[PDB]
Amino acid sequence: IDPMAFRRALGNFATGVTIMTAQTSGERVGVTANSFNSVSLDPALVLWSIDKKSSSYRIFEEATHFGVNILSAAQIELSNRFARRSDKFANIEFDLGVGNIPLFKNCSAAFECERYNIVEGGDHWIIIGRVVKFHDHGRSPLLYHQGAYSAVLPHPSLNMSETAEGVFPGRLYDNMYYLLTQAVRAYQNDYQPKQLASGFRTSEARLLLVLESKKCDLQREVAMPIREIEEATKILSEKGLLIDNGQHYELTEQGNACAHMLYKIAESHQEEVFAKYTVDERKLFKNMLKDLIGI
Amino acid sequence: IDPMAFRRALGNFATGVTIMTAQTSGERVGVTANSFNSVSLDPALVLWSIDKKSSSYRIFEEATHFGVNILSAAQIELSNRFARRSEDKFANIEFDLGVGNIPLFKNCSAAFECERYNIVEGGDHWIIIGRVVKFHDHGRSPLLYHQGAYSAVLPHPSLNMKSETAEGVFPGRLYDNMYYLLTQAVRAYQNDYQPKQLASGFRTSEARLLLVLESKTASSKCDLQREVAMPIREIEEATKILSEKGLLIDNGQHYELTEQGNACAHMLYKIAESHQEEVFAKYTVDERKLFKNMLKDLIGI
Ligand SMILES: Cc1cc2nc3c(=O)[nH]c(=O)nc-3n(C[C@H](O)[C@H](O)[C@H](O)COP(=O)(O)O)c2cc1C
Ligand SMILES: Cc1cc2nc3c(=O)[nH]c(=O)nc-3n(C[C@H](O)[C@H](O)[C@H](O)COP(=O)(O)O)c2cc1C
């Protein structure tokens, strides 16, 4: 099967973002990884897949301990730093655990592991580690879905019911916070099928909407790692929507049209339901939304 | 180390929801699993961990193929059905057959038809590695599982709150749309509510139960599972923790919150209302009333 088409199919499985750290001596490594997952509770075992050609596996193989840093939603810069080969720990504060495990700050969780055993896994090494100490902080996590960073949309869905007061799960869910998250649910249920029908994934749409206006700068605006940007710009170039002459990325006439239609789709739901309101009422709704954001 | 405290710490790593299916004959199994993850591209290898006490591993060990069904956000009922041991999980459940008679569900985000590659020991679980021979890429909005509760994906990249120009706040000039303003409003609200809820020592599973049980008592776990969007296993886990804190009473008929539990549910309500009441205080009562009615129009209630 095609490796690229398979990697893009794996993007449907949303995961968190972890950073695997280890230190021997003074040799230190930091690898951003999303192949992490749990295995067993007794004993406490976790695994993750590291590339066989990664220049960091030698230090993971030499060190007796490695750490799993569950990144929070406010650690996108920390994810991109430990995502490209480099002194990755330059100007990066961290603490040391058992086995000199580099532990970062403001993380959602951390798992200090002893190296349990390594297993063959195709073109990767499956590193199994025994958790000897963990940290449960509970901060809002960072997501990685379809090659783009996202966040978790909280609150359970509402019963779409019998009574007007029975729509909410409880009587206390009639709050502004719950109404905002459920408005995004109803909006996402209307926009996502329309974007998918046009053959655009999340990585493709974010680049069309950004490049239509005006690699590190682009990485910080679309919230996508460099590896996913290079992958998506290639796909957009195959569809005749982008030209990568070597200097920068520019959308074609065909690319600018697709970016504007994605704007029409993201506005079709609000324009369809707010048609009964006046122009001043719709303008007030945006001004009150900006007051919630802070702009 | 404590297994329970360790399992709760594992909830910080948000994952999607998959259902592992296999069929031999007519012997059929379906296990909801979030331990799934990718391994290798060449060859295409994926793994997941199945419990050693699972009554379905024997059929997974016998069958030559098993499937990974990536569930979508509208498949919470399908996740809970295949989340409890039953003799006929596929009753009144439509599905198709792939290679090796792999049961494939409909309306999923993605699917991975795999041949049984190798099984590896993994503590109290079996690590099943499978080689992907066929996949389906649909791209639907996925179902999330974080801190023992079902959730959805909050899209769109964050906006630049520290820029010079007013039009430079958005990543592009086309991001000034109502969809983006709604998602970024939830970001600003979550950044204000989430740190305050954590300061009270309540996770997602605890907060959803406090806000639901405060209104009415919950008799059957099947109904409570459908309202808080949490599997039965997490409800029994969280109601115990709320009971340790003196916030819940399980008399045997129905879950009931204590007066201390009712207090914690009200304080979570004030925190969820503090941000809007603080920024919308300049608006009139009719303007704030219109904002809720226009939000309900977006939802459909
Ligand atoms: C979101 C994300 C997930 C990643 N997951 C893995 C992974 O599971 N295994 C791996 O070897 N590299 C993964 N990488 C790439 C690592 O950052 C990798 O260490 C990087 O290419 C550095 O290469 P080096 O270790 O050879 O120096 C991931 C990168 C990103 C952005
Ligand atoms: C969100 C979620 C994720 C789960 N992940 C796994 C898993 O990765 N491995 C596993 O063996 N069971 C997992 N389970 C338990 C399954 O629901 C499993 O089907 C259940 O224990 C019954 O299995 P049985 O039919 O083999 O007895 C998970 C349950 C839920 C709710």
Side-chain angles (χ1 to χ4, degrees), chain A residues 37-39, chain B residues 15-18 20 29-36 48-57 60 79-86 89 125-126 144-145 148 150 225 230-234:
Chain A
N37 218 317
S38 51
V39 185
Chain B
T15 61
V17 181
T18 76
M20 304 294 175
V29 283
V31 173
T32 295
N34 73 327
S35 62
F36 169 82
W48 69 292
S49 302
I50 186 178
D51 198 321
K52 288 180 160 188
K53 293 142 177 180
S54 167
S55 64
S56 303
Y57 169 77
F60 278 107
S79 179
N80 299 331
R81 164 66 70 88
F82 294 93
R84 292 173 56 85
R85 183 182 298 181
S86 177
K89 300 181 182 181
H125 281 66
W126 295 108
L144 291 183
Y145 182 72
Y150 298 116
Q225 173 175 232
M230 295 169 46
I232 304 293
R233 185 128 291 171
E234 291 307 318

Side-chain angles (χ1 to χ4, degrees), chain A residues 31-35 49-51 54-56 82-83 85 88 144 149 225:
Chain A
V31 172
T32 295
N34 73 327
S35 62
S49 302
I50 186 178
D51 198 321
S54 167
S55 63
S56 303
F82 294 93
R85 306 180 61 165
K88 300 182 182 181
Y144 182 72
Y149 297 118

Side-chain angles (χ1 to χ4, degrees), chain B residues 232-252:
Chain B
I232 304 293
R233 185 128 291 171
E234 291 307 318
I235 296 182
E236 301 172 346
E237 174 89 344
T239 51
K240 151 193 162 54
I241 297 180
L242 291 175
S243 246
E244 292 184 353
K245 304 179 177 180
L247 312 179
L248 186 144
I249 289 177
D250 185 5
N251 56 310

Side-chain angles (χ1 to χ4, degrees), chain A residues 151 153 171 213 267 277 291, chain B residues 152 154 173 178 214 283 297:
Chain A
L153 180 57
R171 72 160 165 259
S213 316
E267 290 284 275
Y277 299 102
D291 283 329
Chain B
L154 180 56
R173 71 160 165 259
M178 279 290 312
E214 186 276 339
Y283 299 103
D297 283 329

Side-chain angles (χ1 to χ4, degrees), chain A residues 1 5-10 12-16 18 34-45 47 49 70 108-109 111 121-124 126 131-132 134 136-141 143 145-146 150-156 158 160 167 169-177 179-188 191-192 196 201 206 209-210 212-213 221-223 259 263 266-267 269-270 273-274 276-277 281 284-289 291-295, chain B residues 1 5-10 12-16 18 34-47 49 70 109-110 112 122-125 127 132-133 135 137-142 144 146-147 151-157 159 161 169 171-179 181-190 193-194 198 203 208 211-212 214-215 227-229 265 269 272-273 275-276 279-280 282-283 287 290-295 297-301:
Chain A
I1 63 180
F6 173 60
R7 197 187 75 93
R8 298 190 295 261
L10 294 170
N12 298 273
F13 181 68
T15 61
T18 76
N34 73 327
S35 62
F36 167 81
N37 218 317
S38 51
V39 185
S40 158
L41 301 185
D42 191 4
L45 299 180
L47 63 79
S49 302
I70 310 296
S108 295
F111 297 92
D123 47 52
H124 281 66
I126 302 179
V131 183
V132 297
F134 59 89
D136 196 338
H137 304 150
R139 295 187 180 92
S140 188
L143 289 183
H145 174 64
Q146 292 185 11
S150 301
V152 172
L153 180 57
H155 306 164
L158 75 181
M160 296 299 302
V167 183
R171 72 160 165 259
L172 293 180
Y173 276 103
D174 190 7
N175 55 82
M176 280 290 312
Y177 190 17
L179 266 57
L180 285 176
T181 63
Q182 296 309 287
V184 178
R185 279 189 176 275
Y187 218 111
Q188 189 172 23
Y191 174 86
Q192 185 70 15
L196 295 168
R201 287 296 188 272
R206 293 189 178 181
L209 297 179
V210 167
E212 186 276 339
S213 316
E221 301 181 41
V222 305
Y263 173 83
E267 290 284 275
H269 185 213
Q270 63 94 357
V273 68
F274 290 170
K276 56 173 178 296
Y277 299 102
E281 291 170 345
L284 178 63
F285 193 83
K286 285 189 58 177
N287 296 332
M288 297 182 66
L289 279 181
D291 283 329
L292 296 174
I293 304 176
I295 58 178
Chain B
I1 63 180
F6 173 61
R7 197 186 75 93
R8 295 191 302 266
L10 294 169
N12 297 273
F13 181 68
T15 61
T18 76
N34 73 327
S35 62
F36 169 82
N37 218 317
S38 51
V39 185
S40 157
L41 300 185
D42 191 5
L45 299 181
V46 295
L47 63 80
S49 302
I70 311 297
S109 295
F112 297 93
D124 47 52
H125 281 66
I127 302 179
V132 183
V133 297
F135 58 89
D137 197 339
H138 302 149
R140 295 187 181 92
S141 188
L144 291 183
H146 174 64
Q147 292 185 11
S151 302
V153 172
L154 180 56
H156 307 164
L159 76 180
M161 299 297 295
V169 182
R173 71 160 165 259
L174 293 180
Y175 275 101
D176 190 6
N177 55 82
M178 279 290 312
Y179 190 17
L181 266 57
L182 285 176
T183 63
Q184 296 309 288
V186 178
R187 280 190 176 275
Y189 219 111
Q190 189 173 23
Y193 175 87
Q194 184 71 15
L198 294 169
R203 288 296 188 272
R208 293 189 178 181
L211 297 179
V212 166
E214 186 276 339
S215 62
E227 301 181 41
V228 306
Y269 174 82
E273 289 284 275
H275 186 212
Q276 63 94 357
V279 69
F280 290 168
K282 54 173 177 295
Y283 299 103
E287 291 169 345
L290 178 63
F291 193 83
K292 285 189 59 177
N293 295 332
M294 297 182 66
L295 279 180
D297 283 329
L298 296 174
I299 305 176
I301 58 178

